[PDB]
Every structure is written in structure tokens, then in C-alpha cells.
Amino acid sequence: HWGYGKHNGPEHWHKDFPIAKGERQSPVDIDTHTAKYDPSLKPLSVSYDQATSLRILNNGHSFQVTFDDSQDKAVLKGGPLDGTYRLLQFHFHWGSLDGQGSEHTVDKKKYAAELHLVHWNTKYGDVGKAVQQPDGLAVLGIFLKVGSAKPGLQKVVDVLDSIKTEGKSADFTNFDPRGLLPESLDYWTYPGSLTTPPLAECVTWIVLKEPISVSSEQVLKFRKLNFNGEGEPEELMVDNWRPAQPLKNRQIKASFK
Ligand SMILES: NCCCN(CCc1ccccc1)CC(=O)N(CCc1ccc(S(N)(=O)=O)cc1)Cc1ccc(F)cc1
Numbered sequence: 001h002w003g004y005g006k007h008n009g010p011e012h013w014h015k016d017f018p019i020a021k022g023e024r025q026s027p028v029d030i031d032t033h034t035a036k037y038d039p040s041l042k043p044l045s046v047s048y049d050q051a052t053s054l055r056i057l058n059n060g061h062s063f064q065v066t067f068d069d070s071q072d073k074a075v076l077k078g079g080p081l082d083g084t085y086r087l088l089q090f091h092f093h094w095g096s097l098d099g100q101g102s103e104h105t106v107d108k109k110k111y112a113a114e115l116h117l118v119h120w121n122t123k124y125g126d127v128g129k130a131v132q133q134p135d136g137l138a139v140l141g142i143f144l145k146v147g148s149a150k151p152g153l154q155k156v157v158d159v160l161d162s163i164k165t166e167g168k169s170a171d172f173t174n175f176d177p178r179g180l181l182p183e184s185l186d187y188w189t190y191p192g193s194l195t196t197p198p199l200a201e202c203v204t205w206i207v208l209k210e211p212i213s214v215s216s217e218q219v220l221k222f223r224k225l226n227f228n229g230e231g232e233p234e235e236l237m238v239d240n241w242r243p244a245q246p247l248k249n250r251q252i253k254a255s256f257k
């Protein structure tokens with residue numbers, strides 16, 4: 001039932017998911033002047049060399065690339081995290097126009113899109129159990145700005161025509177997510193939530209300061225996707241982002257001065 005339209009969008013989600021008005025919801029505005037450098041934070045460890053991508057999928061609210069998480073292949077460690085987090089999937093949020101689309105904002109600035117690499121804490125054994133824990137998931141968030149093309153994204157863009165509508169999937173093997181990462185791993189971190197239902201308060205957010213650049217042609221292909229299933233009125237998959245939520249009793253820490 002939930003979505004991103006006038007009658008089922010983020011302002012309605014609290015009726016089915018009352019945690020939507022909770023104490024650690026995401027996304028948030030990152031006020032760069034109030035985030036405090038935390039010298040105790042460790043460098044992030046992004047170890048993706050052995051990643052095994054499986055499928056690319058239109059799930060009716062985004063498109064996602066799924067990975068084999070049956071083994072410690074692609075893992076996130078370090079930074080604010082205790083333990084090992086396995087990469088499950090990545091997906092994006094994006095806008096109808098280049099001036100909106102990100103979920104997090106930086107000094108109220110919205111980027112054209114935001115990439116989420118979703119990882120779960122292996123001490124909980126499976127992702128369903130991890131979503132029930134305050135430290136169950138770690139999501140690495142990367143902003144997209146429109147400029148030069150990102151070569152490492154093109155293999156994604158070129159297959160989207162084959163998953164236009166909800167439910168459609170395709171083989172998507174041998175995709176290397178390292179090609180989506182910016183140079184710097186400087187980041188902000190705070191405790192938050194899933195940004196789509198069930199909005200569970202289970203996520204350590206790690207948001208990279210450095211955006212990646214993508215071309216207008218690449219993001220325009222995102223905007224050709226469909227929220228609807230095949231044979232239903234065509235509703236473009238655009239503006240599939242939740243707006244910034246109240247920070248409440250939280251501090252955003254920076255890994256960098
Ligand atoms: N209608 C949505 C169809 C499927 N959707 C949830 C289904 C649902 C809906 C309402 C109530 C219960 C369940 C996605 C899903 O299933 N995920 C991904 C969850 C997720 C990951 C990252 C972010 S993000 N944007 O990076 O913060 C947000 C959300 C795995 C999972 C596995 C086990 C769980 F118990 C829950 C989620």
C-alpha cells in the first residue's frame with residue numbers, strides 16, 4: 001500500500017508503521033558545522049574484492065542489486081562498527097529533477113540521488129533477526145551529483161530497460177561495487193533507521209562526504225523505471241526518497257577534521 005504519492009507517501013507511513021515518528025528515524029539533515037570530529041572513530045574498512053552479485057530487481061520502490069551473503073565475501077568493518085557486516089544489496093533513491101532525490105541532506109542541500117549499500121551484522125545470523133536489533137544493519141550512503149559519467153555505473157544503467165516494472169528481475173553477475181565508491185572514505189555517522197517500511201530502528205548510518213558524479217544520461221535512465229507492475233497505468237519511478245526527519249536526541253559524528 002505504501003509508496004511515494006500524495007495519498008500513500010512518507011507523510012502517511014506512520015499509520016501503518018508508527019515507529020515513523022520514533023526517536024532515531026532516518027534520513028536526517030547533516031549540519032556540517034554541528035557534526036563533531038570524533039578522533040576515536042576508526043577508518044572504515046570496505047572489503048568488496050570477493051563480492052558475488054546475483055540479480056538486479058525492480059521491487060516497486062527502487063531497483064536493487066543483490067549479493068550472495070551466505071559467506072563473509074563483501075564486508076564492512078571498522079569506523080563506528082563493532083564486528084562484521086555482510087553486503088546484502090545496494091539500491092538508489094533519486095529525483096524527478098537534478099535538484100532533489102537524496103534522502104540525507106548536507107546543510108539542507110539535496111543531491112540528485114543517493115546510493116545505499118546495505119549490510120547486516122553477522123553476529124545475528126540472518127537479516128531478519130538483524131533488523132530487530134539496534135545495531136543490526138550498517139548502511140553506507142553515497143551521494144550522487146550530476147556531471148561527468150561514472151563508468152562503474154554504466155553496466156547497471158544499461159540493463160534497467162529489462163526491469164522497467166515492479167516484479168521484474170534479471171541475472172546480474174560479476175558486478176563490482178567498488179566501481180561506485182568515491183576516492184575518500186571520510187564520513188559522517190549517526191544511529192538511525194530504515195528509510196522505507198518497516199522503518200526499523202536498526203541502522204548505523206555511515207554517509208560519505210564525497211559524492212560520486214554521474215551523467216545526466218545515466219540518471220535519466222533511472223527516471224524511466226516504473227513504480228507500477230506491467231499492465232497498470234504508467235507511474236514513473238521518480239522521487240522515491242523520504243525527507244529528512246527530526247534529529248531528536250542524537251549527535252552526528254564526523255570521521256574527519
Ligand atoms: N513492501 C516492501 C517490500 C520488501 N521490503 C520490506 C518488506 C516489509 C515491509 C513492511 C513491513 C515488513 C516487511 C524490503 C525488504 O524486505 N528488506 C530491505 C529492508 C531495507 C533495507 C535498507 C533500507 S535503506 N533505504 O537503506 O534504509 C530500507 C529497507 C530486507 C528485509 C528482510 C527481513 C525483514 F524482516 C525486513 C526487511
Ligand SMILES: [Zn+2]
Pocket residue numbers: 091092093116195
Ligand atoms: Zn535506501
